[PDB]
Amino acid sequence: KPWYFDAIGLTETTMSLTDKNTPVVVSVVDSGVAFIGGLSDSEFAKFSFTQDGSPFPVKKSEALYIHGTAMASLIASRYGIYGVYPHALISSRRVIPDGVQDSWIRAIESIMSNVFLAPGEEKIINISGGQKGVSASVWTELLSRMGRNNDRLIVAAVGNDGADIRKLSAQQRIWPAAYHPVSSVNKKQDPVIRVAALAQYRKGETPVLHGGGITGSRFGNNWVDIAAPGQNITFLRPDAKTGTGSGTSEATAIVSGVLAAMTSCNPRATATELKRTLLESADKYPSLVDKVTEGRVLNAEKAISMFCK
């Protein structure tokens, strides 16, 4: 399939361990999703948190026209693009462009208050981007509460431009990745998984973070939980053709697909257990410790095997 399948151990036997009979819906909190091509049969729901009231992506910007569809395709596309977990469905929550204020937060609050979601429906929440220029008070209240609930996970891109997150000011850091709990309890229940982007590699090769002043991965020990494939990534566009991108948006989508695959095996598992198994099962590279907490690199074979076994 794409290069990153073999690189992360997303093999046939790995996928055989998942339960396709258990519905898993990944939340895509983004610019809206076009359920076309390989995503034709992927829709669970779609929501608007934008000022136009529309759940569909708009042409205001080319990047924003395509972005939600791209991410959804990386998680779940059934043909054309090879989704990480093609059995998954997608719940699109459009928050950009022209979001209502705190649209990102409204999107998440909407999940959190919905008791009619079955276990495995919007348990894994993909945020391939987020809010900067953040009184991170509304975010911090919401995330610590979700942490206490111990039911859902937010997979959050650390952002692009290659900056060291430790040296950025609060206004430049991307939320919810910028959530930085300091109490023992809030760290232990932290529901955010912060994802950095790796350059192309083959299994056996030592990964490095994708670099560059434009699409290069942001980085920093204690501000990044895991790194995942994030270079030379092919994705779906709303007009049904493909594009190729690099960065943390793509890397985040891939991690969400792996978590989706795991959840199929026990959708009633705690957020803490899912997060722990993902992180514990990650390959640890001493060369990456400055860039990523414990030098963690996504290993889907081990994550899925451990959780599903």
Question: Which structural domains are found in the chain, ordered by start?
Answer: 1-309 (3.40.50.200)
What is the rounded distance in angstroms from the CA atom of residue 215 to the CA atom of residue 226?
18
Catalytic residue among 27, 42, 48, 67: 67
Catalytic residue among 27, 30, 225, 283: 30
Residue 164 among the catalytic residues: no
The answer for residues whose C-beta is within 8 angstroms of residue 299's C-beta and 6 or more apart is 8, 9, 281, 282, 283
Method: X-ray
Catalytic residue among 48, 92, 249, 281: 249
The answer for residues whose C-beta is within 8 angstroms of residue 182's C-beta and 6 or more apart is none
Position of tokens 């083959």?
A: 202
Q: At residue 249, what is the residue type?
A: S
For residue 126, list its beta bridge partners.
28, 155
CB atoms near residue 267 (< 10 Å): 19
What is the rounded distance in angstroms from the CA atom of residue 68 to the CA atom of residue 149?
27
For residue 93, give the nearest of 112, 74, 115, 77 by alpha carbon.
112
Model resolution, angstroms: 1.8
Alpha-carbon torsion angle 117, 266, 13, 229, nearest 10: 60
Residue 249 among the catalytic residues: yes
Residue 30 among the catalytic residues: yes
The answer for residues whose C-beta is within 8 angstroms of residue 272's C-beta and 6 or more apart is 150, 188, 189
